[PDB]
Amino acid sequence: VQEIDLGLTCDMHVHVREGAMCELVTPKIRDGGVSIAYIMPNLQPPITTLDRVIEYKKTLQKLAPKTTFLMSFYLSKDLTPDLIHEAAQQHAIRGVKCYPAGVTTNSAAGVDPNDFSAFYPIFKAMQEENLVLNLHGEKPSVHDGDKEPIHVLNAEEAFLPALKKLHNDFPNLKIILEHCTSESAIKTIEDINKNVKKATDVKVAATLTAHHLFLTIDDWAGNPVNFCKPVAKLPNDKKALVKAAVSGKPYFFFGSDSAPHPVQNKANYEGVCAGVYSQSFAIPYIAQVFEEQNALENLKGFVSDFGISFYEVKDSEVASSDKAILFKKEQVIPQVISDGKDISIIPFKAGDKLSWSVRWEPRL
Amino acid sequence: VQEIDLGLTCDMHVHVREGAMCELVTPKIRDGGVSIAYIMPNLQPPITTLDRVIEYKKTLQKLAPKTTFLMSFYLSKDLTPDLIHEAAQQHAIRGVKCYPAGVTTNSAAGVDPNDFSAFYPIFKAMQEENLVLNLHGEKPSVHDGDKEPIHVLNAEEAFLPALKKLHNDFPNLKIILEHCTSESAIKTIEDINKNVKKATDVKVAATLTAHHLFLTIDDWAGNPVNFCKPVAKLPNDKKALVKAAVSGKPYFFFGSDSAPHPVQNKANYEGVCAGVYSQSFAIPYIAQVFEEQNALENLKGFVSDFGISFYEVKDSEVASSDKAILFKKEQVIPQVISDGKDISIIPFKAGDKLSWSVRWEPRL
Ligand SMILES: O=c1[nH]cc(F)c(=O)[nH]1
Ligand SMILES: O=c1[nH]cc(F)c(=O)[nH]1
Ligand SMILES: [Zn+2]
Ligand SMILES: [Zn+2]
Ligand SMILES: [Zn+2]
Ligand SMILES: [Zn+2]
């Protein structure tokens, strides 16, 4: 069979929850082919204190000894510059993730993106400490009308001005637009990096999930098992995301936004939970897209090089030097991923076949 | 004011199913404030024979004796022109409802709206007997190359050319574009009727449901109770649909498409059944919209005059001359509508309050 050496794979956008769900999914980071994971903080309650973020990490390290864990704070009014400096100096966090209020899971305690200025003390601290500002780039929905209405299909586009202002007011702050879903977002990211030479000139980057390289609105209309935020959009939007993933440009890299929910939280008649579970086959999902685009040469950059470069991951922190090797063995996605107790998850593309699998090999 | 006499209200898009669902739902046409109801044919198997429509009608008359029932055929691969003639002259049907294949509930036995020509002999038979052809105007979805993609958001707009051709080849045929959802469809219906002098000049008309005057995509993204076909679209579309409802023009009138399903067919993680159940409060729902637009003068035309005029309903056919009286008593929509046995339904806008109720008064 043929093999592809991918090195230290990166998934810079992971949800791993708490409790038994966390014991179920955290080992699946490695099985999915991912060596380094950026952990998102939207627990209940949100992670806003130093002791709890340092209480979450070793719990994950205990569940997965070989996986490198970059942690984050949840952007909240309970954060202070001294908290940001203390957390950075103790190597507890690697960035702060912002959730607009009400737009996705556990975002009710979030910020209004028609402000952001109230968090300028926080951004100055993060800029001084070289932390990353992660943005769930969606404006909350407004349907009445003075300004043009915001809804799930243009909310991301309506957010692009807020990103542009943040980057102008903080030119040295590393900012990621998480899980880009619209062509407008791709063009804004490309234009911001118009005079970019090498990868380290990138200060504003964007992550792309696995599922948005497959899904369009027709896949989640009537299928809550494919419903997520931001919502998958039009075929032209999916084309732009795929061309950006295989582009080879250093300001697009992989962030799965694997968001597990028990099956009974997706089979609601109202209030369905947003989120697609992709951890168990994260790298093979991406390999399939890259294979169909005849762009497999560019896979290592999108899932490994560019995320390590942007996050400045050193071997000093990496928990294991094992290399993820992709090999072309066909496999079938199970129908459920269960902990054999109370938790069952429907995986992304359940029942479908993938051309690749993943194994680990040490270095030297 | 306090009371509005709406006369003989008509809901020209009704689904009542069979069995225990039917016994539950059919009496709620009258409870909703509707005297005349056009019954749809998408049962299992579809209604395509004279014996099955008549027995269906007899069941509905037994369950709701004071409700006037207009029946329909399912546009099917085994319908015949002489069937249309025999059914029309026996006064068993008033029209044939077309379902594009796969686009909605029980549409698998449907048509491909790209080769309507196979049904022109049937359309020519319906034209001769002055029957109504009801159109679920949506093209089936296309993601597969060359041709521009079709999805739930433009499937209605992609269907408008077919409606245009069908009316051009059959100018005397009464055709209804059922449940409009897009501004594109509204503008096309306006253009088809540019200089129509009054209601009997209308031959291509459009029905608006109750739920499409409230809903947008943000309401059904995470709420399968509000998921239906065609999907509710953008605020700009709802602007047009609402405006057309209160328009006072005779080519827009009420058709609820109340489509009941048991709750367990809505709380799926995939394959959610399309359909919003609104029968039980059909007229009060619409009264809310006409009230909020300060257009209650036009409620009688939208909910009674134009439907009766277009379908040319005569007093000889009506099962009861009782008048629908709308009166401003506040009521609360239940959380569930149950038959006390196996069937529970979440009504549209469950738990919300309506400013109006409806009662019946006889003709003396
Ligand atoms: O962006 C997100 N979508 C869905 C989730 F469950 C989550 O936790 N975060
Ligand atoms: O147009 C329709 N949508 C949903 C249904 F269940 C139905 O029967 N008809
Ligand atoms: Zn997010
Ligand atoms: Zn996320
Ligand atoms: Zn329909
Ligand atoms: Zn219908």
Curated annotation (Swiss-Prot), chains A, B:
Disulfide bonds: none annotated. Induction: By N-carbamoyl-L-aspartate. Pathway: Pyrimidine metabolism; UMP biosynthesis via de novo pathway; (S)-dihydroorotate from bicarbonate: step 3/3. One of its GO terms (molecular function) is metal ion binding. CDD domains: DHOase (cd01294). Zn(2+) 1 binds at residues 13, 15, 97, 257. GO terms for cellular component: cytoplasm; nucleus. This is Dihydroorotase. It comes from Saccharomyces cerevisiae (strain ATCC 204508 / S288c) (Baker's yeast).
